[PDB]
């Protein structure tokens, strides 16, 4: 199962998210421009 907004990739972030690089890595939202 994909990653959620708080976990890195993989698991590849779920629909709407993107893998936000950094340490610790964490997926964030692509369509989250706020």
UniProtKB/Swiss-Prot annotation:
4-carboxyglutamate modification, residue list: 32
Keyword field: Disulfide bond, Gamma-carboxyglutamic acid, Hydroxylation, Ion channel impairing toxin, Knottin, Neurotoxin, Secreted, Toxin, Voltage-gated sodium channel impairing toxin
Protein origin, superkingdom: Eukaryota
Protein's cellular compartments: Secreted
Tissue-specific expression: Expressed by the venom duct.
Gene Ontology CC entries for this record: extracellular region
Residue positions, PTM 4-hydroxyproline: 10-11
GO molecular function: sodium channel inhibitor activity; toxin activity
Disulfide bonds: 2-14, 9-19, 13-27
Primary location recorded for the protein, binned into one broad class: secreted
Domain-level remarks: The presence of a 'disulfide through disulfide knot' structurally defines this protein as a knottin.
Protein name, entry field: Mu-conotoxin GS
Species, as recorded: Conus geographus (Geography cone)
Source taxonomy: Eukaryota, Metazoa, Spiralia, Lophotrochozoa, Mollusca
